[PDB]
Amino acid sequence: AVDFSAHPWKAPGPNDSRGPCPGLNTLANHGFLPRNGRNISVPMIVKAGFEGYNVQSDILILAGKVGMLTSREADTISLEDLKLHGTIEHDASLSREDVAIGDNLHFNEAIFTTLANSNPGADVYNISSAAQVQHDRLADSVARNPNVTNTDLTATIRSSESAFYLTVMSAGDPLRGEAPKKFVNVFFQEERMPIKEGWKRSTTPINLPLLGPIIDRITELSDWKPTGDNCGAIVLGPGL
Amino acid sequence: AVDFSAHPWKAPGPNDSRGPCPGLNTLANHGFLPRNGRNISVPMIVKAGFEGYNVQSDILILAGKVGMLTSREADTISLEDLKLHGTIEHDASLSREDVAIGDNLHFNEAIFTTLANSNPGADVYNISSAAQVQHDRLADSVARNPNVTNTDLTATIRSSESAFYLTVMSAGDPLRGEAPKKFVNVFFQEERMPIKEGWKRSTTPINLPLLGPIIDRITELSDWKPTGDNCGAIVLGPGL
Ligand code: HEM
Ligand code: HEM
Ligand SMILES: *[C@@H]1O[C@H](CO)[C@@H](O)[C@H](O)[C@H]1NC(C)=O
Ligand SMILES: *[C@@H]1O[C@H](CO)[C@@H](O)[C@H](O)[C@H]1NC(C)=O
Ligand SMILES: *[C@@H]1O[C@H](CO)[C@@H](O)[C@H](O)[C@H]1NC(C)=O
Ligand SMILES: *[C@@H]1O[C@H](CO)[C@@H](O)[C@H](O)[C@H]1NC(C)=O
Ligand SMILES: *[C@@H]1O[C@H](CO)[C@@H](O)[C@H](O)[C@H]1NC(C)=O
Ligand SMILES: CCCCCCCCCCCC(=O)O
Ligand SMILES: CCCCCCCCCCCC(=O)O
Ligand SMILES: CCCCCCCCCCCC(=O)O
Ligand SMILES: [Mg+2]
Ligand SMILES: [Mg+2]
């Protein structure tokens, strides 16, 4: 009963709220979430992620309610609210700069180069390439950001995000933990579902049982180590 | 204008969900929240706290959305869900036991003795008595619970809770940070608004600007120090 032809991609206008998350931004750009990116609740996110990507309520409720903390409203956010550093938003992003040394909100092609150039010799990104990218992005933050934060929690969130692009933008079974570069690149660079390019919503549900072993393997292959205090404390609201 | 005659106290039935919070339990017991204690949203908490206690949306949105993390639902909790240790629920409670060594959910008269016996020779509890109680309760946990968690965050939450009973159950201006023992005792022991005893909803709004100096003073007088790592990390959801 979901009609993708009734969900065309449209570029956001200058006052349409967009955040640091390509997943939610893409849903908004197709009208699965409000195109203005505002007044978004967790039930709305659950429905949009199901309809758009076949992502299940388990992960979207867990992440969604943490995301709600970033606004001043009782039960909604704007997508831009999610840029709040140290709730979910973190250093060593795949396509954004660290907030201490740049723009933690907008897609940045220079940052994205690392991901774009990963898995040489193949037309997919996969678990080993995803891990290499995480290793390299963290190394970049440690090199260049004097305020870098790197904890078990940020590392887990980062692997979760890599698992998302490998699964949601997959061509075959999302279980395989690989996704066409052509699909993933459109997802990040244009925050668009690559429909003309051949992408289709997964027919396999993407939930925590599916993602968990992928996340853990990405972490394992990334050669991640604690670097500092390692306290997994999140920011509980804006303006504290 | 709030009609308290239309909000009578009724004892919870066997299937009514109740949690570790006397504030929310009392609102449920008067039907300001659903008497069954289920499917409770942050907007419902905001409205109930305003109507019942004149507590404003600043504190209830902030605390409410953190409380939402304790359930598996998109935008509601059951009151019992709030017992989840390490989200809001903490050791050295005023009226509950530490989860590692007892029941962190139900009112416990033996624990409550410390509060009940505080401020000898006055008919109010006040900021100095509240601080002494927090000191003594923490000392008890440090003595008897080898797994005690005691951090900047838990200390702040604890002082916030003491500030709540001093203000919401006040007779005079809540600014004064003192409340009749007869009112506070009914609040904890029966999770009832002490209307027959003479209590009335504050005509002064109770918000973060009002609570903040009370919180800080309680902490200052309590001779507080952190335990161990002093890591302000919360549990982000159940079953992790
Ligand atoms: C469930 C609700 C969601 C919330 C609240 C959320 C929130 C966020 C936030 C705050 C970030 C920024 C982290 C950072 O890079 O600093 C982010 C990144 C990301 N999210 Fe989401 N997200 C959600 C769902 C999704 C979904 C459904 C996808 C699907 C593919 C997704 C894919 C991503 C990816 C790939 C990134 C990494 C961007 C980068 O590192 O540059 N997210 N998310
Ligand atoms: C006017 C509103 C409220 C009042 C007056 C109030 C009052 C209190 C008090 C006095 C305690 C301490 C109980 C003790 O130490 O034995 C407490 C504990 C608690 N409250 Fe509230 N509360 C209010 C709102 C909230 C809200 C909105 C939430 C979350 C949605 C919440 C969650 C809790 C939790 C989880 C505890 C347990 C902490 C612990 O003792 O371990 N409260 N509350
Ligand atoms: C936000 O959404 C709620 C729920 O649908 C609605 O009642 C409210 O009017 C909306 N506000 C705006 C500004 O659109
Ligand atoms: C990822 O693809 C590369 C190149 O095809 C391959 O060498 C590597 O084994 C793959 N890793 C996984 C986990 O499939
Ligand atoms: C960031 O690091 C610099 C250099 O160490 C330091 O002066 C500054 O206080 C830090 N800022 C934050 C946000 O901690
Ligand atoms: C209400 O909470 C119950 C658990 O108490 C949960 O099963 C249900 O999905 C929630 N939703 C509704 C429809 O009330
Ligand atoms: C609390 O009451 C006691 C006894 O009346 C008094 O000694 C003490 O100074 C009071 N403290 C405050 C903060 O008012
Ligand atoms: C296995 C744990 C995954 C959930 C981590 C906490 C919530 C953050 C959501 C991660 C997804 C995202 O950030 O896009
Ligand atoms: C300013 C840091 C506090 C962050 C919010 C956590 C919960 C606030 C405590 C509210 C009182 C209560 O738990 O009943
Ligand atoms: C319930 C905890 C929330 C905040 C507790 C610590 C700060 C005191 C209140 C904030 C005062 C203010 O700046 O308006
Ligand atoms: Mg980031
Ligand atoms: Mg407790």
Author numbering:
A (entry chain A), B (entry chain B): -3 to 236
Pull verbatim passages from the article behind this deposition:
Here, we introduce a close ortholog of MroUPO, a UPO gene from Marasmius wettsteinii (MweUPO-1), that has a similar reaction profile to MroUPO and for which we have set up a directed evolution platform based on tandem-yeast expression. As a member of the heme-thiolate-containing peroxidase superfamily, UPO activity is fueled simply by H2O2, which plays a dual role of oxygen donor and final electron acceptor. In general terms, long UPOs are monomeric proteins with a molecular weight of ∼44 kDa and with a strong preference toward small aromatic compounds due to their narrower and “carafe-shaped” heme channel (e.g., AaeUPO vide infra). By contrast, short UPOs are either dimeric or monomeric proteins with a molecular size of ∼26 kDa per monomer, harboring a wide open and symmetric cone-shaped channel (frustum) that dictates their preference for bulky substrates like steroids and long aliphatic compounds (a preference attributed to MroUPO, see below). Here we present a new dimeric short UPO that can be heterologously expressed at high levels in both S. cerevisiae and P. pastoris, an enzyme that shares its substrate profile, selectivity, and biochemical and overall structural characteristics with MroUPO.
This type of binding maximizes the hydrophobic interactions between the main part of their corresponding chains to multiple residues establishing the contour of the heme channel (Ile55, Leu58, Val62, Thr152, Ile153). It seems apparent that these hydrophobic interactions govern the binding mode shared by all of these ligands, as the two alkanes fail to establish a polar link to MweUPO-1 residue Glu157 made by the carboxylate of the fatty acids. Indeed, while most UPOs can hydroxylate fatty acids, mainly at the ω1/ω2 positions, the progressive one-carbon shortening of mono- and dicarboxylic acids is a feature exclusively observed for MroUPO and MweUPO-1. Here, the captured lauric acid confirms this capacity, with its carboxylate coming into close contact with the heme and enabling shortening. As such, the results obtained by soaking MweUPO-1 crystals in lauric or myristic acid may be explained by the dependence on chain length described for monocarboxylic fatty acid shortening by MroUPO.
